[PDB]
Amino acid sequence: DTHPLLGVGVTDPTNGTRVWESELDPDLLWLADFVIDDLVVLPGAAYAEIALAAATDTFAVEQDQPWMISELDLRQMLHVTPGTVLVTTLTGDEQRCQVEIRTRSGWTTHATATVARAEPLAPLDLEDQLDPDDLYQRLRGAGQQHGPAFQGIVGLAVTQAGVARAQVRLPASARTGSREFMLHPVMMDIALQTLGATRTATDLAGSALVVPVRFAGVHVYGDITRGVRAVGSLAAAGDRLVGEVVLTDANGQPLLVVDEVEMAVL
Ligand SMILES: CCCCCCCCC/C=C/C(=O)SCCNC(=O)CCNC(=O)[C@H](O)C(C)(C)COP(=O)(O)OP(=O)(O)OC[C@H]1O[C@@H](n2cnc3c(N)ncnc32)[C@H](O)[C@@H]1OP(=O)(O)O
Structure with a gap:
């Protein structure tokens, strides 16, 4: 236990x-x-x-x-x-x-x-398809080496406004030993990986290692291992990057909302 x-x-x-x-x-x-x-x-x-x-x-x-x-x-x-x-x-x-x-x-x-x-959840675009293999290659070229348990992005697109939209799944090798989790870390990381496909991210790689240094407003509304869609947006903040991610289940219910993820560029 x-x-x-x-x-x-x-x-x-x-x-x-x-x-x-x-x-x-x-x-x-x-x-x-x-x-x-x-x-x-x-x-x-x-x-x-x-x-x-x-x-x-x-x-x-x-x-x-x-x-x-x-x-x-x-x-x-x-x-x-x-x-x-x-x-x-x-x-x-x-x-x-x-x-x-x-x-x-x-x-x-x-x-x-x-x-x-917790604060309760309140009630109050043309795409370009991308290849998930290209996202993981970009991350590895930056020194970020996700093994199989973390390779949960299985479909990927980016909107004209530069927002990334991913289909996600939890790999089998991430599932054992998870009964006690409030928030499955591998699943949260997979949601964050979507930020690597935003326009801001691909412009930067078009590399440097980008790592989170601060989260603000991490909201968890249910079991995030039920998440199937992640939407991420990323903006420059001077020499840093600031993102926002939402993970939803198959019925469109938000499971994880990260209001701010602040990243340093090394
Ligand atoms: C492209 C898209 C891809 C998107 C793709 C994303 C996919 C997911 C990838 C996930 C990657 C990871 O998870 S990586 C693992 C998780 N991340 C980490 O472990 C990062 C840990 N942090 C760090 O290593 C460091 O912060 C580092 C970044 C090297 C900077 O280190 P330095 O101390 O040398 O630099 P700092 O000044 O400290 O850093 C910023 C501030 O940190 C704090 N600091 C120092 N003393 C402090 C104190 N006593 N109390 C509070 N804070 C203090 C202060 O707030 C600093 O200002 P002052 O007070 O004046 O000091």
Whole structure:
């Protein structure tokens, strides 16, 4: 019943802080399939799941998706090596809490997140088809090496306005070990990959490594492994890039909405 990324938790009686430790290894589940410059790196989406799982393990709430991520900061890349120990802390209350994700070196901080009670979903184009193989080739040429578990874009198009629209699926090798996820990281990453097909992205490659450094307004309305369509838009913000992605199910219901994904260009 133990979450494979968050691990097992205790509350420190001397300060009220909840603390978890998990043992990570490159052979754990699908982690080996997320590679940057030949090194196994923990994907940004995994930190989002860890923060949501931490809140869910701390507070009793009788809702399937009680939380949103107000802000998540990705401060330092994590190289997943044998014997890695991920240390998560949570402070706060059932309305708003602060999560910090570290590795045992002392400790190094990899991500911080503010988690809050979910805001409900409110009710208030000509295309050019693209080849998904070309997207993954562009990403690999930039040093972003998604293995089979992450190769979930199976159809792709871009609108005249430069918005990317993808048909998505969760590869079988990403499905084991997922029962405990609030937000399936591989699925969230697949949704983000759509940003690589926007006009802004292809103009930049027409390369440099583009990595997420901040998420704001991550909304989860259901089980995102039911997602079949992702729509992503990307704009320049000075030397950075800012995107927005929506993942919907086969009946058009939004499952995941990321209001801002801020990326650095290396
Ligand atoms: C093309 C389309 C493709 C689209 C295709 C997309 C498909 C999905 C691809 C997914 C890829 C990944 O998931 S990659 C894995 C997830 N991403 C990551 O791990 C990125 C982790 N972050 C980083 O490595 C770093 O931020 C890095 C980018 C190298 C910049 O590092 P530096 O510290 O050296 O530079 P910084 O100044 O710190 O970075 C920005 C700010 O970070 C913070 N920082 C420093 N100390 C801080 C502090 N004490 N408290 C808060 N923040 C602090 C401050 O906010 C900084 O300003 P100051 O306060 O003054 O310091």
